[model samples]
Target chain A: SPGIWQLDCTHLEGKVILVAVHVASGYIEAEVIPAETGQETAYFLLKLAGRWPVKTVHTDNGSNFTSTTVKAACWWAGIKQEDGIPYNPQSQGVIESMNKELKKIIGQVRDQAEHLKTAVQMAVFIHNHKRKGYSAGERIVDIIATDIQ
Target chain B: SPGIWQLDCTHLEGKVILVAVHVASGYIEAEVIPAETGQETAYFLLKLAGRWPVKTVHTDNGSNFTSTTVKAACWWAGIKQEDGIPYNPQSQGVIESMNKELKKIIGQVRDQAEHLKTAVQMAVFIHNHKRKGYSAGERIVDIIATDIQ
Candidate 1:
């Protein structure tokens, strides 16, 4: 997902925040970082893996996501990395959709710094529960969600 | 190389932090992760390519690193992923040494959290600069050459 920040914070104007989720469960975790460092990006993902088992993480060809620093950590942790096509969004619909939904909600409260974090968190919380469903028929959804309801 | 983390952090113990350096310039980057995910591992390297010119990334025969997840990214990013001898650390001395210094530094701070991040960063900073300068012999002595799809 893309970096996000509240509109009120001039102090954090250039900083970016990240949101992570579990592909299987739709769980959400978010944090703000000083800069879009790959290592911090990896660190963010690492923090989440402590509670849940992760097999793969995905990203676009963005600078922060692609670095020797971030790649090596993923190697050591045994987490596989996946990439969306260059300039192609269809291959990365899930995350793109999440970012869109998040921005929509974030923009509504962009003026409220205190509520921004909570709003982001709350959106993820609600979305995960709401998105808890498996594929129906199209081409056979690969990721089967157990207890999707 | 996979992440080798401390055994002390309740929230982070046993997790891996990856270390990567440019073979020629000794530039350094590091990150912490929960698992040794392969796809993200490759994802990490791809990002580095954006920041710097990346040609090949080296790895071992661990099941996670050798799969299509890692390979495909390397392929997509156009950074060839080179494998090391299985069960041999000596063969990967460059990173092995980096880990040794990191672990040594990490050990020094195992009992102190107040200075862990600082100490670790300091240690990495020192190592990277200390490792600068490619061998004159290798630059002139070595010229090596790799694919369709």
Candidate 2:
């Protein structure tokens, strides 16, 4: 019910998006909010709702994130919130990629882009709704089992 | 241009097969259509369309997959399609995990279970496409001096 995860925000068309990305799963959770962290209750509901099994939360150090209200809530939920290392970005590539593509999309539109919120939601769905490779058994050369017939 | 992926299929009544899963993103792409290699064309198009920038394709050994039709297409697209290790599934992984999830969904379906085709689609969407988490972020601490500062 838990995994390593990330959180961050990007602004596009003057709209604010607070995004939560699960590390191992690449599942994205985001919303158009007033700001990054003032909405503590709204933010916690996303995790509390269990769409993501996030036990540890990682974020780049930001004033919006380090506030007391947000910290206390994370404590109450037993979620370990850690700040990301500065400069070196490879370790944080997963969500960085997410933000990049997401911003590219929403960035191209207006906040009023014919249901922008739902459109962003659909973007997330399409991001997670692709079906390409599944259970496609792999190729192998001749081999013999060690202890089985 | 970057995303983690997985591919697999699950069979239902009368040996009907449905397939494809994108791991780390949990996007399930499966179909009950009988044209196997033909479906490969459709499946590859899903990635090519670009909501998910899947740069590689990983699979297990299977006749429909090993037939060269799919591999040829993968090469043509400059996408790396690799094979999983025989009897030992680890690094090139997550396909097994997806197969497990897809089957569990199908196994529980008794509401007109005979309608396996669309049901599998439903299963795929249900398995990967979830919108439960939307606004989760965390707290942070002090940061070191920046190179510029």
Candidate 3:
């Protein structure tokens, strides 16, 4: 929860969804992006950092994650960029599964409408609200509030 | 926060702390174990699953995590076992850093008393309560409740 974040991208209907998950709390924030380039990813990171504390970001060794532009943004934001091994998937399993679930939710939303943004927002909403019975059915948002208080 | 958990252990003053983090919510649970054997870890997992839904557990290729006892426990709990690449610290960075931070907090707590259990609980409490500010200071608990609702 110490600002550690995970980053990944999923393609949906020709657009890119830049997804980020707070490794500690599992709180997620994602949106549709124009491209999967470093600049676009950088913009997403900056925006994400604005709302959440981001100390380190773990991602697979993809160009979109390793580009100089993205690194510069990380440097500017005081974020430590940690790239996973070239061929390993377990390293980013958290975000990968999140992307998988997001796509599922998006697909469900698409069944009813064509609004991509609405679908993503709906997925994030559904995820962040779901209770972890292990924590006594407390939602992440409730955990954040009480834990902070 | 679909029951995906990350697992790792840390040592504090000779006691082993088995730590589990929910990947989506960043919710954490840890307790001192008598030993680092597969059986003890398995017990921890069972106790954890009693309260929290656990779909998958990501860990380094440690013996305690891969032993027959642990595997059987996973099988019984409806959990999938995903092992990270050998010698890859990045693969388990989330729990590694968590262990690192937990030790820091435990150290602070120890300065006032010798209660190791107390130290670990206090550390978890402090970490979970700290405001993330990114979600307008909404905590993981809050996110879980609202999202589920």
Candidate 4:
């Protein structure tokens, strides 16, 4: 939940969008990356490590994750890398569900904002700030805001 | 030249980044568009109209600019759309130069920031706010900041 981050990649406007969803708080961090190469993917891992106490990273069976570049990054960061069962979509349901909502939020932001980059940032901010539980409850923003503080 | 803006599109990270440069002030505005279609381009026109007195828009012989959708947008917004000569790179030198600098700035931003959207906004803000004249001269931000006020 806190340190267990499930990572996945999706396409948007012909770009590669990498997403990481926290298993416990349901918090998400997404970025539009230049490519899906292991070199690029490793950079994102380093970014996450700088921001959070990321002990483990979960992903599906993608070559980018299995690549030596990414493995080296994980090794140095002291982060455990876990891969899902091949051909088993159910194994990554948390990230799959998060991507569904993230796409919708991104589309809404794009319609209102002038830039795709702005839309993505605004969408991430909005999603994190919104309350997840019924009525008045704590949110991802509230959770992480305190954790960071 | 103040109200004359040059428009162009460039690709980055598999997405379209539309850039507009004010001729007189040397001010720049850039956004990552979802597509390079006429409809999408029209929305950017509307966005610019809201931000500045975009009376005339200059572009190359791109179909997105020539498309009926953009034409209608320009008509309703009281904007005059001007197209450059086909196969004449010199005719669109202003936008070409702006795009070159914009790409470099964007690359720098993306390398540092976590989100592409945030990077684009920061890059535009930085470019517009930077001094254009030698030593200590007025900047696009200083010019527009007063104009907006």
**Candidate No. with top TM-score:** 3
TM of each candidate vs. truth = 0.39, 0.40, 0.46, 0.45
Chain A TM per prediction: 0.60, 0.70, 0.79, 0.81
Question: What lDDT would each prediction earn against the true structure?
Answer: 0.45, 0.48, 0.65, 0.64
Instruction: State the lDDT of candidate 1 residue by residue for A1-149, as single tens digits.
Output: 11111111011235555766544434455555666667676655544432223457765345534677667655644567665343554435666666676667556645532434444443433344343243111001112111111
Candidate 3 lDDT, tens digit per residue, B31-147?
777668886777667555544446788764479556998887677566788774535556467666777877887787665434566456556655654557533224434544455
lDDT of 1 by residue, B3-99 (tens): 1111111113566565555554344455556665775465455444433235666564456445777776566555666654425555456556656
Candidate 4: segments with Cα more than 4 A from true spot: A86-91, A134-149, B1-149
* Clash totals for all candidate models: 22, 13, 37, 2
Which runs of model 2 end up more than 4 angstroms from their true locations? A40-49, A86-88, A92-94, A105-113, A131-149, B1-149
How much native contact recovery, as a fraction, does model 4 achieve? 0.00
On lDDT, the candidate that comes out on top is: 3
Q: DockQ numbers for every candidate? A: 0.02, 0.02, 0.08, 0.03
Q: Write the per-residue lDDT of candidate 4 for residues A1-149, one digit (tens) a residue.
A: 44677778887888878777666666666677766888677766765653445778886446856789788767756689987453556656756767778889888768755556546655665565465542111333234334433
DockQ of 3: 0.08
Runs off by more than 4 Å, candidate 1: A1-149, B1-12, B86-90, B108-120, B131-149
Q: TM-score (0 to 1) of chain B, per candidate? A: 0.60, 0.62, 0.80, 0.80
Ranking by lDDT: 3, 4, 2, 1
lDDT of 3 by residue, A1-149 (tens): 55677787788888888777776677677767767888667766755553444678876447956598788767755688887553556655656677887888777756533457656755665565455663322433444445545
* Candidate 1 CAPRI category: incorrect
